[PDB]
Every structure is written in structure tokens, then in C-alpha cells.
Amino acid sequence: KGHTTGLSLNNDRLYKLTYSTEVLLDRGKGKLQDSVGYRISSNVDVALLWRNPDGDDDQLIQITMKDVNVENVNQQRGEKSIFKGKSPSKIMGKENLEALQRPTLLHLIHGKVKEFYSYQNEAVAIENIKRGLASLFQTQLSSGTTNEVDISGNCKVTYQAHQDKVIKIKALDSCKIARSGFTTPNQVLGVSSKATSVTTYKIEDSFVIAVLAEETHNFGLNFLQTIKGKIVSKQKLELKTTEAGPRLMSGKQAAAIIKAVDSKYTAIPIVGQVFQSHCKGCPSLSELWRSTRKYLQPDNLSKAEAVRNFLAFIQHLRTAKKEEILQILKMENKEVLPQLVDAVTSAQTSDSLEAILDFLDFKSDSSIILQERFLYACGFASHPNEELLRALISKFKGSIGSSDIRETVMIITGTLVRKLCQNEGCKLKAVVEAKKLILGGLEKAEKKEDTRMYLLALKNALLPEGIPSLLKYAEAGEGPISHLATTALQRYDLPFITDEVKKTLNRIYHQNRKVHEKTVRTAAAAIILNNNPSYMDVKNILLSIGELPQEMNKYMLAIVQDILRFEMPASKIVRRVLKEMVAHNYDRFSRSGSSSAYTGYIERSPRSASTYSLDILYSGSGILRRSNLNIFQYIGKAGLHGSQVVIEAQGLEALIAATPDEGEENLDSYAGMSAILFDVQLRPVTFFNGYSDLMSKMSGDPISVVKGLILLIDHSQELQLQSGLKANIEVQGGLAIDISGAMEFSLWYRESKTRVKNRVTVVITTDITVDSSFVKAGLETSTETEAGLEFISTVQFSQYPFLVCMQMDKDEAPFRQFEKKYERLSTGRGYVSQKRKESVLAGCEFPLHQENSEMCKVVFAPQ
Amino acid sequence: APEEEDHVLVLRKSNFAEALAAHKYLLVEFYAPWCGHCKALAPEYAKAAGKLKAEGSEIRLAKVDATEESDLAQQYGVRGYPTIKFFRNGDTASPKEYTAGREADDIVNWLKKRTGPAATTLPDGAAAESLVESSEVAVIGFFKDVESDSAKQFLQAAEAIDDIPFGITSNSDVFSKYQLDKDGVVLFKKFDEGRNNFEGEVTKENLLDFIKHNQLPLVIEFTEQTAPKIFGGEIKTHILLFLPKSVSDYDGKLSNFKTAAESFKGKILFIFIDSDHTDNQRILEFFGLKKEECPAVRLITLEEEMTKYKPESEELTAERITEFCHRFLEGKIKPHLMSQELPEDWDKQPVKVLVGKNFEDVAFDEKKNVFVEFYAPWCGHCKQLAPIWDKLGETYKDHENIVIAKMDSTANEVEAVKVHSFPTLKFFPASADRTVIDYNGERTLDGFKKFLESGGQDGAG
Ligand SMILES: [Ca+2]
């Protein structure tokens, strides 16, 4: 690429320029208000030292900053200004100022940087500023696209040559440079980012006389758009005049001339380099943890401070080393330790992973609870990678003391396969190993408890090549295992639920070959109705209503009514079938029984929506067989399975003097729960198995069920600004869950009351910083809410059918916003401004189906 | 290569055209594995099939599982289960639907009625008496000339309608026996008037219009037997008389119903149902009725949506019922939505009380800015809002256009607004179009006032 040309200088002339750079941090409303930052200004001399005697466009220029000063960007700082009465030397340091004002050589070929020269022993931050200024001299007077190296790394660059200007647009996404950072590809939990870099070269009489560059970085939390920030960085380089300059130096090669100019001059890279803050008098991990641990008591995980400390500590862990982490783990007590395992696993660095893997013995039975916390934290890991998968694969291949934990490992492996498959890593080595391990572990049919494990893993991994096995198991008529396979099919996307899939599901629903359980049949029909059902698909299901066992008619009717009521995909085709009186009439649509299905909105906006869904299948006895609660979250087309909570029961008929349905008299009495949290299918939990175990455990006092801290939102950017400054964007979303259940039961009184309280505390933090080592500006915000959702179930079971009143109740929630902006000087408190807002979000009840409202009228009647 | 499950062919998607080719005459049962009527009919079907296997000819009995071979069921327009369709493979363009009885006898007797003549020739008065007595509905065509144009019209209408027996007589002693001077067509039935005489031109078309109209009884009792006949018919407007068998003066009450039925023969199906019967309890719940609220009438229309209608009066004299059906047919009766009783003094207090009955009247008033709290009576959130909402009413009690109201959303149905939580505050401005503005600001007197004064723009867009 030797045809373009950039800057040209005249022999024996010294160019006198002015140079300015400033940075602004803003809350980013769109219009920049009262922001923080700083301006660095100087004079600039440029002299041509050498030109290649071969006549080629090959030159060596010398660039010097003089009269460097650092000032406020904000005009109203007054007596709060960090620079008040301080010399440039006192602001940056004697040695730094000297370094900044020492000259720099730039060897340009065809107007592009061939080599940059400077003094080796200088601070990185300062070499960056110099590199920033030097990078502006690289340009092209004609239009085209190309790849260039400068402060920003190796980037694709586009030039638009106009009459009085050339425009240099840099493709910031394409830049090759080593910078830490990460961001989830999940639209609902993610952070949107825009980076622009535009440099304008002002032309007069074919020569550049000025250079104006503006760089912007915009971020916004997808979920909640009031949480955003902006970085604006500008550069201005103006030619003032020319003077008589040094005489040209003679030589065949540029390198020799440089050694002759000064032999301390060394070739250094033009690309900007990372530098560490270098903390002065800062406490160690153990000192921090000593304060943090006061807030992470199991008793008060619900307070916003707990979550705040959790998130803050995760930042510290992200810079700590294996040993200091391992130490803290080793000296901690049993009560707080689960919280610290949460924090350590969330950190998601090589060092934090190794510290926790080392700390946890999978053969121990004394650290079962911590094994779990570790593994669940990996499930929710915001940015998992091959290393995390590899660790898990090997834990599984190793020895594990508890088989529940062995199951958990395989289940979480499922999620990690899912996540890495959605992040262009479906063909990564450890992914293919874990795929073979799941798909293979499901073909080699071992013990029954082993098939369940693999099915749950596949329920998470959702590999399409697993579907034929799922169909085999759904059809097997193997009860618990058949339902599981069915519910796993239910998680796949519409293009995977083909005709062949629906053909199988039809045979299961219609019982063309053999009898299947009610739970399996209903789930199969749900998948059909939800996945582009044909006219006859819908017609046959409608015609079956009134001809199935007691509660199954009520349930299927409820499913269909809910499709109409909530305008689901198959709405239109169902309405077509409803035209016919034979299918749609007050005989078929008149059902007794308790079973139900209801979908509502939690929140709806033009952009985002949140839904709740409750569907309950009862036994003929009137005792619950299967309830599904589902909460989904949407942003545009993008979705997130926030929550699923499935409750199963069998053989509980003896707890009243009731009798089991036809067939169910040999069924052992059982109650369980299966849950999804933020797209992750968890390990199902048995409440009790068999009569003796039931009569063994047992009442109306709260009982912890799930407790834990989760790092849900996690966005990190390290940025090399074109000016040379260092910028960091960090967005973290943490929450604390605290679910607790209570039941009152009286056989004599024929009454039951169940209360499940879900306590949810969310804290979302943002942090923007620009650092130059002698000065630093930051903008941080904290948004917090202490939410609460309660589900209550009141049962009066004196006469079948029983009175059941269900309630979904969202508590009044406190909502608190914090902002802190600062300008700081490497020593001293600097300028700090803080604001606080504190509102209250109002509570409500969510309606369920109208029949439920009717039963609640009676339950809460005035007498 | 289909199997003979009790001498009955099993027809699948792949092998349907081949077997349709290999028999000139084919009777197919479209059924469902879970279907009760298909279960009850399955062995009688096997009988008629078996009886024709060792005595029959070319007519072959087949069955298709429509839940498995659904393409077929759709292709041939199956209605419910079972559906029996007769295929000739001389007309692959439309089979003939079987409509007769479900006994194995009725089948073969219907098959031979395909080969034999549409009507039996009645030589004398005794043969006439016989046929009239053979069925619930019978039709005789009196035609001097059997070869006549008129008479060939009638013989076509007697091939079409298969659920009624037809007779033709050209004997004058028969004519005079039923009091016919000229040619004609008489329908006889064992209910209601007993006899209907055809009028106007003797076209196949005009015949079917006469038969179909006069074949139906005035009133039908709702039973598991009559139910598929009701929902198989073409009348999509039903009036139901919920009449308990135990009620006093059952006969008198049904009598009035039978009377009213006359004025609306072709237009509204008059049905009575035993409100005391256990089987019917589910149906009572569908019409939101209790055993103790009977006797009562309800009218329903059966389209894409089912819509129920209540009479303005509670009296069940033949007059009130006719008056009901008449006002319905005009457009003067409103769909029955769940609603509480409007209190006498619903507008006595600063906060207006709205029910389902008067909701659209108040809220969608073009000249009024109405702000409504939709609540549940047991909800603590709604209970907490009540004092603030009261103070808001108090603020606006003398206003020129703002109305503060409330409605119990669990006790009243409104078609225009969906309530997704309790409480919900919705604003209905003074506007020509039915605009609805959701309020999502602070639940405070201050928040409310700011929103009301901005005309709905400061608290919600
Ligand atoms: Ca209005």
C-alpha cells in the first residue's frame, strides 16, 4: 500500500501548533449537563529531521509538547477546583512533566506510521498521551478503506476525501488490542454499547491546517433504560505558523540518523498500553473481607447493603490472586461461608476458579451445601468459557461423595453447553466432549436414576440431535421419566418442533397405541397447541374435550380458553375451529372440576413485557397433581425464562379419608418441586417420598427453601481512548433471593393455608472512569429495590369440590437511587458530589382466572 | 391389505385410495379412540359387517382413526365423531353422509335403500296407515301421474332426505282418505299439529324447504341423546328453559314455552332442560344460574363466540317469552355480562360506584373525564388506596367534568378494559373516541391531581 500520501512538511521549517485534549463523563441523557473530567493543553513544535534520499515519500519528523497544563472542563468548580494554586509540575509530578515535554520521533512512509521513537524509561500513562498526539499525524488525503496501526491498535479505517476536509472514521469494533472485558449476548440481561471515532482533517490549499477528533462511548442497560452513561473525548490540533527550523540531517537509513540524534531513543510501539492504578495505602483482600463479612450474614441477605457489599467485593476478587482468596475461604465459618462461595464463584477469573476448586473437596460430605452454591453460581455465570466447562467435566469424571451433587454437576454442564453454543463456541473441544457425554450418557440406558440425570442435563443443553431420544422417552410410558422428556421438549424453539414431533405427541395425547399418564398427555398437547398446530391438530383436541377423565377435560378446556383470552400464536387457528357449532357449544364448554390455566401481564410497554402463567391439573380426588407457575420477561423479540415453579403430588389421598383415582391405589405418596431460574433448570427437590418418610418429618412456621446471592448482570469494558487516556465501564446487577414456605393443616377443621414468600433484592451499579495517572474522573450510580412476592393458597375441603382461593401479592417496594461524581489528583480527596433519591413503588394483587376470584369472594365473605 | 377387525376394514392414509378403488361401494366410519358413541357403535358396526360377510355382496365396511389419519377426515369434511360416509367411487367428489339409526339393522336397511326406490308405492289406505305409523315423521306424495313432472320432483326430494320414509300413491281412495282433491304432498308427524300440507310449486327445492322446516318438533328436551342432534343442526340461536321436574305446574310452564316456540319456528331452537338433574349442574354454571333461581330462560347465540342473553322480565308466560325473543331478534337486548346491582345511591358520594350494567354509560361519556379505580374487595393494596381515593373524590365533587369512580372488577365484567392487577387506575377522557389512559404514577392525592389537571399527560404520556 504505497500510493497514498498524508502529511508533507517543508525542509528547514518548524511548525508551531496548539494541542488540546479533553474528556467528559455524563449520565448520558443525550444533552451533557453537569459533568466531570479534565482538559490537557500544550504547544506543539514539529520539525522534519530527515527524508529518504531515494526520493520516496519517506520522512522522519520530531514532535514536542511544551507548556503542558491541566485544567477543569466544568466552569463552575470555583473554590472546589482540584487544580487551585498547583503548578503543572505539582499536578503531574516533576519526572512526568519532563517526560511529557521530551521530544518524540515518528517515521512515516506514504503518510503511515512505520515506527515510533521515544525514551524507554517513562511512565506508561505519559507515553500514551504522547502516542495519542503522534497518532493524529497519520492520515491520507484521498478516499478509501484500509488497516492502520495507532494508539487504538490495529483498526479498519475509512477515509472520505472532500473539498476542504478529509474524514477519518475508525471502526472501533475491529481494533486488535489486548483489553479485558465481557458482555452477555442475552438481550434481556445485556448492556447496549456504541463506540464512534471520527477525526476530521481541515484542508487549505491542499495542506492540512487542523485536525479535530471526537470519540464517544454510550452504554445503556437493556432491561431498564434510565441506567446509562456517556464518555466524550475530544482532540484539537491547529497549525498557527511556521518558523525557520533545524537543517535536514543526512544518511541512507532513518535508523542511523536516530542513533545520531540521541542514542537513548528507542523504537517503542505506537499502540496504547495498559497501566495499573498502583494503590497507595490500600487494604488487602483480608482487610476488605473483614468489613464485607459483617453484611453477608445469613440473617440479613435481604437488605440492600448485603447485595451492595457482595457486588463491591466481587470487584476486589477480580484483581486478587489464588492464595489470598484461598486464605479467606480457609478461615471463614460455616454460616457466612456460603455467601463467600457465591462471591468467589461470581468473580469468574482463572485465580478465583482455582481457589474455589482447591478449597472444595467433592468427596467431603461436610461441604455439601458449599458444593451446591459453587455449582449453581456457575449456572448463573455471566460470561462462562471453555475453562469453566473443563473444570466441571473433570469434577464429574472425578469422585463425588453425594450423588445429588453428581446430578447437579451434570445439570449445570447442560447450561454451560447451552451458553457456549449461543456464543459461537458450539464447536469448542470441551463443548463437543460434554455433548457426547450427555447424548451418549442418554443412549447407554443404565439405572433409572441415571437416565433422569441426563434428561435434566439435556433439558438445559437443548441439543436438537437429542430430540429423537426425548420422543423415545416421552412415549415410553415410564411415568416420571416420560413427563421429564415431555417437559424438556417443551423448552425447544418452534423450528425444532416439526411434524414428526407432533405426530408422536398426537399418539401420546390420543392414546392410539397405548395408555399414557394424564400429566404426560396434557404436556404433549400443550407443546402441540404452542407450536404451529394444524387445523386438525386443534380440531381433534377440541373434540376430545368431554370424552377424557374428570379433571383432564377441565384442564384442556382451560388451556384453550387461555389461548383465546391471551392471543397466543395459535389463537387465529383455534378461532377458525370455533366457527363450527359441533366443536364449540355450551355442552362441550360446560365443565365441572377445579383444574385451571391463566396468563396475565406483570408489566407491558411498547418495548418490553413481563407475563405470569398459572396452570393447575387436579386429581379426581381434588388433590393437586401438577401446578406450573411461569414468569417470562421480554425485550422486543428477546425473551428470558425468569422463573418456573412446578409442584407435583401423588398418593396423598390418605391424609384425608379420600380414595385414589382409578389406578392410583398402588402409587406411593410423594411431593416434589422442579424449578427454572433465569433459564436454568435446577435439580428437582423431593419434599418427601413414601408414607413413613412423610409421617416422619412432621408446623406453621417459616422455612428457608432457597437462599443465595446471584450476579445476574455483568458488563466490563477496558478502553484505550485515542487521546491515550484509559477508560473503564462497569455495569453489575446483583440480587438476593430468600424464599420461605409455611403450611397450616387441620383434618378435623378441613382447612389448609399455604404461604410462599419470595423476597427479592436487586442492586444495579454503574461505574465510569477516565484515568491519566496524575488525574482521574469517575461517575458511579447505584439503583436498589427491596421487592417481595407472596403466593397464598386457602383450602376449605369439607365437601368436594373443595373451595380453593389462590392469591399472588406483590409487596410495596422501596426504590433508592445514588450518584457520585468525582475528579481526583492521585493524592487528596479531590472534588466529590453525591445525590440521593428515595421513592416507593406501590403494591398490588395479580388476578388469576375468574373462577378463582369467585372462590375468593366466598372464602373472604363478610362472615 | 387392510385388516378385518371383526370383518371391518382398517383404512389408513397410505392405503385409502387403493381400497376405495377395490370396492364399488364403501361405508367408512370416521372415529376417535376416546369417543363414547364410537365405542357404543363399534360392535353393531362389526355385526352389520359380519352379517354382510356371510350374506352380503360388494358393500364393505371400513373405519378410519381420524385422530391418526387426520388429513382424510379434513379432506372429506368430518363434523364430529363418529361420522359415517358412503362412497361409490363413481362420485369421488362427494360421499353421502349416513344420518339414520345406530343399530346394526338400521345400517343394512339404509344400504338397501340406496339400491331400491326412494319411496314405497302405497296401493291402498292400509299401506298408507302403516307407513305413517312406521316413523315419527313420514311424508306421502299424492300424484295421479307417477311419471308426472311434479312426481319426478318429489321422487328426487325423497332420495335426498334419508332420515324420513317417503310414500307415493296414485290411488284415488288414498287421496280421498287424507282429504286431497288435487295432487299434493303431506307430511305426517307424531307430535305438535301431526299433519302439514305442502303449498305452492312442487319443486325438489320447495319440498326440502317444507320438510326440513316441518320435521323439527316445537320443543326439544336436553339429554345425552338429543345433544348431538341439537349441535348437529343448523339453528345457531337457542333459548333454554331451565325447568326443574319437581317444580309446581310443570305442564303449565312447558305449555307456555311450547306456545312461544311457534312464533319462531325456523329462527330459534326452543330447548328445555331439567335444572334438578345432576348431569345438568355444569350447564347451570355455564349460564351463571343456581338451582334456586329456576325456572328461568336464557338465550344464546353460537358463533366464533358464544353470547348469552337474559330476559328483562322474570315472568314465564307465553307472552313474556315471545316478547323476549322478539326484542332479541330486533337488537334491543344487550349481551348478559356478569354485573352487580346498581345501588340506589351509587352517585350520592364524591366517589361514584360503577357496576357492569352502567359502566359504559358513565366511563365512555364523551363530555366527562372519568377516572376509575378497578379493585378486588379482599385486597390490602386496594384497602390502603381507599382513603386516598376518597380524598380525591372529595377534591373533585363539584367539578364541571371530572368524575372519580370505582368498580369491583371481580364482581363485574367489562368488555372494553382488561384489568391485570388490583388496584388498576384507568383514565377515560372527555373524547369522541373511546380513549383509555393507564395511570402508572404515584398513588398519592398529589400524583392524581397533577395527572387529572394535565388532562392525562403528566403521569402517563
Ligand atoms: Ca369519558
| CATH number of the domain that residue B363 is part of | 3.40.30.10
Could you give the CA distance from residue B234 to residue A232 in angstroms, rounded to a whole number? 73
Q: Choose the closest CB to A587 out of B79, B227, B380.
A: B227
Could you give the CA distance from residue A160 to residue A157 in angstroms, rounded to a whole number? 10
Outline where A587-657 has alpha helix (H): none
Q: Is B379 on the interface with A (CB under 8 A)?
A: yes
**Torsion angle (degrees, nearest 10) of CA B219, B222, B226, B227:** 130
* Contact call for residues A13 and A243 (beta carbons, < 8 A): yes
Does the annotation count B294 as an active-site position?
Answer: no
Q: Is B2 on the interface with A (CB under 8 A)?
A: no
Phi-psi region of A144 (alpha: psi -120 to 50; beta: other; left: phi over 0): left
Could you give the CA distance from residue B204 to residue B213 in angstroms, rounded to a whole number? 14
Could you give the CA distance from residue A523 to residue A640 in angstroms, rounded to a whole number? 21
CA angle B366–B369–B371, rounded 5-degree value: 130
Residue at a domain's end among B83, B99, B115: B115
The contacts of residue A615 (CB under 8 Å, 6+ apart) are: A555, A558, A559, A562, A596, A597, A598, A627, A628
Q: In what order do the strands lie in the sheet with B184-189?
A: B119-121, B166-169, B137-142, B184-189, B195-197
Could you give the CA distance from residue A757 to residue A755 in angstroms, rounded to a whole number? 6
Helix, strand, coil % over all residues of chain A, rounded to 5: 30, 35, 35
**Torsion angle (degrees, nearest 10) of CA B386, B390, B396, B398:** 140
* 3-state SS, residue B188: strand
* 3-state SS, residue A438: helix
**Domain-embedded: residue B341:** no
**Domain-embedded: residue B16:** yes
Most distant CA atoms of chain B, gap in Å: 95
Could you give the CA distance from residue B441 to residue B457 in angstroms, rounded to a whole number? 11
A545: closest CA among A529, A531, A532, A534? Answer: A529
* Contact call for residues B188 and B141 (beta carbons, < 8 A): no
* 3-state SS, residue A681: strand
A254: closest CA among A270, A267, A269? Answer: A267
The contacts of residue A313 (CB under 8 Å, 6+ apart) are: A288, A289, A292, A343
For residue B29, what is the enclosing H or E element? strand B26-31
Do B196 and B272 lie in a common domain?
A: no
The count of domains in chain B is 4
Whether residues B66 and A540 touch (CB distance < 8 A) is answered with yes
A636: closest CA among A605, A607, A663? Answer: A607
CA of B371 to the centre of ligand 1 (A): 8
Could you give the CA distance from residue B11 to residue B26 in angstroms, rounded to a whole number? 11
Q: Which amino acid is at B92?
A: T
Q: What is the DSSP letter of A682?
A: P
B210: closest CA among B191, B226, B239, B189? Answer: B189
Q: Which amino acid is at A521?
A: R
Concatenated DSSP letters of A698-722: ---S-EEEEEEEEEEEEEEEEEE-T
Q: Name the residue range of residue B22's domain.
A: 5-115
* Residues β-bridged to residue A69: A41
B321: closest CA among B259, B249, B250? Answer: B259
Could you give the CA distance from residue A121 to residue A52 in angstroms, rounded to a whole number? 29
Residue at a domain's end among B215, B250, B270: B215
Whether residues A581 and B35 touch (CB distance < 8 A) is answered with no
**Domain-embedded: residue B45:** yes
Does the annotation count B325 as an active-site position?
Answer: no
Question: b/e map of A662-677 (b: 16 or more CB within 10 Å)?
Answer: eeeeeeebbbbbbbbb
Give the minimum alpha-carbon distance from A226 to chain B in angstroms, rounded to a whole number.
16
Outline where B118-249 has alpha helix (H): 125-134, 149-160, 172-177, 204-215, 227-230
Question: b/e map of A530-565 (b: 16 or more CB within 10 Å)?
Answer: bbbbeebbbbbbbbbbbbbebbbbbbbbbbbbbbeb
Give the mutation candidate from B10, B30, B31, B34 for the A interface (greatest A CB count, under 10 A): B34
CA of B358 to the centre of ligand 1 (A): 13
Whether residues B283 and A575 touch (CB distance < 8 A) is answered with no
Place of cell 456457575: A378
**Torsion angle (degrees, nearest 10) of CA A790, A795, A801, A806:** -10
Could you give the CA distance from residue B59 to residue B78 in angstroms, rounded to a whole number? 21
Could you give the CA distance from residue B85 to residue B78 in angstroms, rounded to a whole number? 9
Do B206 and B246 lie in a common domain?
A: no
Residue at a domain's end among B56, B84, B115: B115
Q: Choose the closest CB to A511 out of B33, B66, B80.
A: B33
For residue A765, what is the enclosing H or E element? strand A751-771
* 3-state SS, residue A179: coil
* Contact call for residues B295 and B275 (beta carbons, < 8 A): yes
How many Cβ atoms are within 10 Å of B308's Cβ, its own excluded? Answer: 16
Could you give the CA distance from residue A221 to residue A712 in angstroms, rounded to a whole number? 12
Could you give the CA distance from residue B237 to residue B301 in angstroms, rounded to a whole number? 5
Could you give the CA distance from residue A186 to residue B15 in angstroms, rounded to a whole number? 50
Give the minimum alpha-carbon distance from A160 to chain B in angstroms, rounded to a whole number.
42
* Residues β-bridged to residue A674: A646
CA of A760 to the centre of ligand 1 (A): 39
Do B183 and B87 lie in a common domain?
A: no
Residues of A in contact with B419 (CB under 8 A): 847
First to last CA, chain B: 71
Could you give the CA distance from residue A776 to residue B87 in angstroms, rounded to a whole number? 89
Work out whether the CA dihedral B376, B377, B379, B380 comes out positive or negative: positive
Whether residues A847 and B422 touch (CB distance < 8 A) is answered with yes
**Torsion angle (degrees, nearest 10) of CA B228, B229, B232, B233:** -150
Nearest CA in chain A to B235: A581
Chains A–B, number of C-beta pairs less than 8 Å apart: 125
* Residues β-bridged to residue A658: none
Residues of B in contact with A812 (CB under 8 A): 381
Could you give the CA distance from residue A202 to residue A645 in angstroms, rounded to a whole number? 64
* 3-state SS, residue B325: helix
How many Cβ atoms are within 10 Å of B366's Cβ, its own excluded? Answer: 10
The contacts of residue B147 (CB under 8 Å, 6+ apart) are: none
Could you give the CA distance from residue A585 to residue A557 in angstroms, rounded to a whole number? 12
The contacts of residue A553 (CB under 8 Å, 6+ apart) are: A545, A546, A547, A591, A593
Residues of A in contact with B69 (CB under 8 A): none
SS3 assignment for A499-565: HHHHHHHHHHHHCCCCCCCHHHHHHHHHHHHCCCCCHHHHHHHHHHCCCCCHHHHHHHHHHHHHHHH
Nearest CA in chain A to B440: A842
First to last CA, chain A: 91
- What values do phi and psi take at B228, rounded to 5? -65, -25
Quick one: how many helices (H) and strands (E) in chain A?
A: 23, 28
Helix, strand, coil % over all residues of chain B, rounded to 5: 35, 20, 45
* Contact call for residues A731 and A221 (beta carbons, < 8 A): yes
* Residues β-bridged to residue A229: A219
* Residues β-bridged to residue A787: A760
CATH class, A13-268 region? mainly beta
Could you give the CA distance from residue B427 to residue B304 in angstroms, rounded to a whole number? 31
Question: b/e map of A58-75 (b: 16 or more CB within 10 Å)?
Answer: bbbbbbbbeebebebbbe
A42: closest CA among A68, A11, A64? Answer: A68
Quick one: how many helices (H) and strands (E) in chain B?
A: 15, 20
* Residues β-bridged to residue A711: A734
Do B224 and B314 lie in a common domain?
A: yes
Nine-digit cell at B293? 333461581
- What values do phi and psi take at A214, rounded to 5? -130, 130
Q: How many residues does chain A have?
A: 863
- What values do phi and psi take at A726, rounded to 5? -100, 130
Do B369 and B450 lie in a common domain?
A: yes
Measured in whole angstroms, how far is the alpha carbon of residue A422 from the centre of its chain? Answer: 13
For residue A133, what is the enclosing H or E element? helix A124-135
Nine-digit cell at B214? 316441518
* Residues β-bridged to residue A603: A610
* Contact call for residues A787 and A833 (beta carbons, < 8 A): no
CA angle B246–B252–B256, rounded 5-degree value: 120
Could you give the CA distance from residue A598 to residue A343 in angstroms, rounded to a whole number? 38
Do B97 and B9 lie in a common domain?
A: yes
By CB atoms closer than 10 A (0-12, 13-18, 19+), residue B358 is: middle
* Contact call for residues A613 and A530 (beta carbons, < 8 A): no
CA angle A801–A806–A812, rounded 5-degree value: 170
* Contact call for residues A352 and A325 (beta carbons, < 8 A): yes
For residue A839, what is the enclosing H or E element? strand A831-841
Place of cell 389419519: B69
In the PDB record, what is the listed experimental method?
A: X-ray
Question: b/e map of B68-106 (b: 16 or more CB within 10 Å)?
Answer: bbbebbeebebbbbbbbbbbbeeeeeebbebeeeeebee
Q: What is the DSSP letter of A241?
A: E
Bond prior to A495 in cis (omega within 30° of 0): no
A108: closest CA among A146, A135, A143? Answer: A135
Q: How far is CA A364 from CA A357, A399, B143, in A?
A: 13, 10, 102
* Residues β-bridged to residue B407: B374
CA of B365 to the centre of ligand 1 (A): 4
Residues of B in contact with A539 (CB under 8 A): 70, 74
Q: Which amino acid is at A515?
A: V
Bond prior to B423 in cis (omega within 30° of 0): yes
CB contact residues (below 8 A), chain B span 218-247, against chain A: 227, 231-232, 236
Nine-digit cell at B424? 388498576
* Contact call for residues A325 and A286 (beta carbons, < 8 A): no
B89: closest CA among B30, B192, B139, B16? Answer: B16
* Contact call for residues B216 and B226 (beta carbons, < 8 A): no
β-strand pairing of B9-10 with B26-31 = unpaired
Could you give the CA distance from residue B275 to residue B243 in angstroms, rounded to a whole number? 6
Could you give the CA distance from residue B328 to residue A853 in angstroms, rounded to a whole number? 31
CA of B431 to the centre of ligand 1 (A): 6
Could you give the CA distance from residue A444 to residue A451 in angstroms, rounded to a whole number? 9
Could you give the CA distance from residue A847 to residue B417 in angstroms, rounded to a whole number? 14
Place of cell 319443486: B203
Phi-psi region of B6 (alpha: psi -120 to 50; beta: other; left: phi over 0): left
Could you give the CA distance from residue A677 to residue A710 in angstroms, rounded to a whole number? 11
Could you give the CA distance from residue A509 to residue B67 in angstroms, rounded to a whole number? 10
* Contact call for residues A177 and A195 (beta carbons, < 8 A): no
Q: Which amino acid is at A577?
A: V
Question: b/e map of B120-152 (b: 16 or more CB within 10 Å)?
Answer: bebeeeebbeebbeeeebbbbbbbeeeeeebbe
* 3-state SS, residue A296: coil
Cα radius of gyration (chain A): 34
Measured in whole angstroms, how far is the alpha carbon of residue A184 from the centre of its chain? Answer: 4
